[PDB]
């Protein structure tokens, strides 16, 4: 469960609206804002004494999230496990 | 700021059931990552863990007392409730509530970052 | 790493025809749209045509519209330009490129080929 | 068709000098403008996209700005290696177009 | 409950560094935490995950966990630090607490 979310947009900067979809420990968050994204966006997590368990550390996807137009919250979207998605606009 | 407070009876007789209520503020009991536990401490003695409840309705109990312990929560009033049945005189102690830090990957408790004030309970005829 | 190689250039007469191609490698060619841009010696850049990643839609400059056709093959990772009814004014170095474009191409990168010289005389 | 123009047509400057190039669009293209650099015998290289977005690997002495119809390109401290012709491209609407270009020479 | 062993007390002068340790069977396999308590009051978390301070906790506090022994240290111990310190650790999600150590300053 390393892949957590996606960024969609055009310029992908603070000039225009962009769509950010991120899963966290208990929910899924969808936001649309004039985000100022990090040079290399990611989520920070740390691990327990045993490698089997982990906890939320910091959120490092963007430096700012101004002029938001949309927000939605629900439950997480997420042998080996195969997950498939289709994204349309 | 995150705060918790205990309330309930301060005196019960032997062979009676006690209910203690924890009131919380600064956070919602329905928020992910949230949990609350209960601990008791007899006069001059060390802390003894009783039980805890998580936001996902998962629960843990101390195996030495589990048979007499129940923990529930009110999702509307933001409260957590502990029940101890059939108390004996030896169960005289100060009872505490506290917030529980827990790991998300695999259910595993960590530490109590926020504690209440404690309420003294006497068991006596 | 990323390569774009134009070829098929040569010397032809007015009223004739010539077909150019551009080989692509080192990247997911079939994921990107492509542009043709030409430049005469001592002159600035002239945009020629654009084709979508799927080879669906095609766009042309008025200077070549009705005479030139843009096409592609995603199995051979090759971009093509079919030019008919050539004129002296078509003398230029023809480039294939993946132009960075936040609106149309969707590319986050910008690549240009070596260019191939076409002469009409 | 959106037409692009540039000013000056050419300029000369010494090492350490500040150099500016102005571009103008016949139509409002928002910030949808690319700045390209070209030297003789070579293909154009992109230095700036979306008006002011500096490309990775481009030296900090380069910058861009402007919006709507009026755009600018600046070199804060000209080097011997910065002698080249710069072009503006608009990509708001197809067909895309390039400007006439501005040449920077050595003083 | 998980077993934790502590000294009954430690004694230092003000301005000196105090150290309280706790031993067990599986401390090297689990994270330890420490709490400070005074009579008539609830305990406060001073150290968690072996060597981390909670916000609001004086910079004097530090700790470690090695050789199946947990440590709490107070650098430049003040008279305000004259309190009972407890060690906690978990084993298979079962809690354990030590007897507590009374620190005299
Ligand atoms: C955790 O990973 C480390 C390697 O980084 C390994 O040495 C250790 O044994 C692992 N522990 C468990 C419980 O998997
Ligand atoms: C975006 O937010 C700023 C304040 O942070 C405001 O001044 C500006 O007008 C807003 N832009 C739009 C289009 O609302
Ligand atoms: C996860 O996202 C939800 C929704 O925004 C938020 O309430 C919660 O605090 C976030 N963090 C955790 C640990 O759930």
Largest sheet of chain B: 6 strands, mixed
> Globular, elongated, flat, extended or rod-shaped: what is the shape of chain B?
globular
Number of helices of chain B: 0
Structural class of chain B: mainly beta
The proportion of residues in beta strands of chain E is 35-45%
Judging from the principal axes of the Cα atoms, what is the shape of chain E? globular
Bound molecules: 2-acetamido-2-deoxy-beta-D-glucopyranose
Largest pleated sheet of chain E: 6 strands, mixed
Report the helical percentage of chain E.
under 10%
Order of helices and strands of chain B: EEEEEEEEEEEE
What count of helical segments of chain E does DSSP give?
Answer: 0
Distance between the amino and carboxyl termini of chain E: 31 Å
Identify the strand order in the major beta sheet of chain B.
2-12-9-4-5-6
State the separation between the terminal residues of chain B, measured CA to CA. 40 Å
The class by helix and strand makeup of chain E works out as mainly beta
Which bin fits the share of residues in helices of chain B?
under 10%
Multimerization status: part of a larger assembly
Instruction: Estimate what percentage of residues of chain B fall within beta strands.
Output: over 45%
PDB class: viral protein/immune system
Keywords: sars-cov-2, coronavirus, lambda, s309, s2l20, s2x303, C.37, antibody, Fab, S protein, spike, fusion protein, Structural Genomics, Seattle Structural Genomics Center for Infectious Disease
Entry title: SARS-CoV-2 S (C.37 Lambda variant) plus S309, S2L20, and S2X303 Fabs
Chain A: Spike glycoprotein
Q: Which descriptors would you attach to this protein?
A:
part of a larger assembly, 5 chains, B: 125 residues, mainly beta, C: 121 residues, Immunoglobulin-like, four-stranded antiparallel beta sheet, 46% strand, globular, binds 2-acetamido-2-deoxy-beta-D-glucopyranose, viral protein/immune system
Protein model, in words:
Chain A: Disulfide bonds join 33-68. Chain A: It comes from Severe acute respiratory syndrome coronavirus 2 (2019-nCoV). Chain A: Residues 44-66 are annotated as: Disordered. Chain A: This is Spike protein S1. This is part of a larger assembly, with chains A (89 residues), B (125 residues), C (121 residues), D (107 residues) and E (105 residues). With 89 residues, chain A is mostly beta strands. Chain A has strands at residues 5-8, 18-23, 28-47, 54-74. Chain A is globular. Chain D has 107 residues and is mainly beta. Chain D has strands at 4-7, 10-13, 19-25, 33-38, 45-49, 53-54, 62-67, 70-75, 85-90, 97-98, 102-106. With 105 residues, chain E is mainly beta. Chain E has strands at 9-11, 18-23, 32-37, 44-47, 61-66, 69-74, 84-91, 94-97, 101-104. In chain E, the strands form two sheets. In chain E, strands 1, 3, 4, 7, 8 and 9 form a six-stranded mixed β-sheet that branches. In chain E, strands 2-6-5 form a three-stranded antiparallel β-sheet, with no helix packed on it. In chain E, β7 (84-91) and β8 form a beta hairpin. The N and C termini of chain E lie far apart (31 Å). Chains in contact: A-B, A-D, B-E, C-D. The interface between C and D is medium-sized, with 24 and 24 residues. One 2-acetamido-2-deoxy-beta-D-glucopyranose is lined by residues 50-51 of chain A.
């Amino acid at each position: 469960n390393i892949i957590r979310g996606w960024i969609f947009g055009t310029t992908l900067d603070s000039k225009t609206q962009s769509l950010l979809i991120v899963n966290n420990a208990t929910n899924v968050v969808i936001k649309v804002c004039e985000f100022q994204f990090c040079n290399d966006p990611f989520l920070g997590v740390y691990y327990h004494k045993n490698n089997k368990s982990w906890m939320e550390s910091e959120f490092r996807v963007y430096s700012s999230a101004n002029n938001c137009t949309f927000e939605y919250v629900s439950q997480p979207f997420l042998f080996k496990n195969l997950r498939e998605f289709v994204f349309k606009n | 700021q995150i705060t918790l407070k205990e309330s309930g009876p301060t005196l019960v007789k032997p062979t009676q059931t006690l209910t203690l209520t924890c009131k919380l503020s600064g956070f919602s009991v329905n928020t992910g990552g949230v949990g609350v536990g209960w601990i008791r401490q007899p006069p001059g003695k060390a802390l003894e863990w009783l039980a805890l409840i998580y936001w996902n309705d998962d629960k843990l109990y101390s195996p030495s007392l589990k048979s007499r312990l129940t923990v529930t929560k009110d999702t509307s009033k933001n409260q957590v409730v502990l029940t101890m049945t059939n108390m004996d005189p030896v169960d005289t102690a100060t009872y505490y509530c506290a917030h529980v830090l827990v790991w998300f990957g695999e259910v595993l408790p960590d530490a109590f970052d926020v504690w209440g004030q404690g309420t003294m309970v006497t068991v006596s005829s | 790493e990323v390569q774009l190689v134009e070829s098929g250039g040569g010397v032809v007469q007015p009223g004739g025809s010539l077909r150019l191609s551009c080989a692509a490698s080192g990247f997911t060619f079939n994921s990107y749209g492509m542009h043709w841009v030409r430049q005469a010696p001592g002159k600035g850049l002239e945009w020629v045509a654009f084709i979508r990643y799927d080879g669906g839609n095609k766009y042309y400059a008025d200077s070549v519209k009705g005479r030139f056709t843009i096409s592609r093959d995603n199995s051979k990772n090759t971009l093509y330009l079919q030019m008919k009814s050539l004129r002296a004014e078509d003398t230029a170095v023809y480039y294939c490129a993946n132009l960075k474009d936040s609106r149309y191409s969707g590319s986050y990168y910008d690549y240009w080929g070596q260019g191939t010289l076409v002469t009409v005389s | 068709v959106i037409w692009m123009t540039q000013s000056p047509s050419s300029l000369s400057a010494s090492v350490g000098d500040r150099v500016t190039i102005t571009c103008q669009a016949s139509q409002d293209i928002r910030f949808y403008l690319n700045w390209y650099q070209q030297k003789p015998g070579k293909a154009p290289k992109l230095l700036i996209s979306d008006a002011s977005n500096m490309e990775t690997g481009v030296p900090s002495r380069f910058s861009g700005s402007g919006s709507g119809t009026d755009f600018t390109f600046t070199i804060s401290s000209l080097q011997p290696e910065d002698i080249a012709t710069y072009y503006c491209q608009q990509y708001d609407n197809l067909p895309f177009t390039f400007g006439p270009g501005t040449k920077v020479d050595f003083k | 409950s998980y077993e934790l062993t502590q000294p009954p007390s430690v004694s230092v002068s003000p301005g000196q560094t105090a150290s309280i340790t706790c031993s067990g069977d599986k401390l090297g396999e689990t994270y330890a935490s420490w709490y400070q308590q005074k009579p008539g009051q609830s305990p406060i978390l001073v150290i968690y995950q072996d060597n981390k301070r909670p916000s609001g906790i004086p910079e004097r506090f530090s700790g470690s966990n090695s050789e199946n022994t947990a440590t709490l240290t107070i650098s430049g111990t003040q008279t305000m630090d004259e309190a009972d310190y407890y060690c906690q650790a978990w084993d298979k999600t079962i809690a354990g607490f030590g007897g507590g150590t009374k620190l005299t300053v």
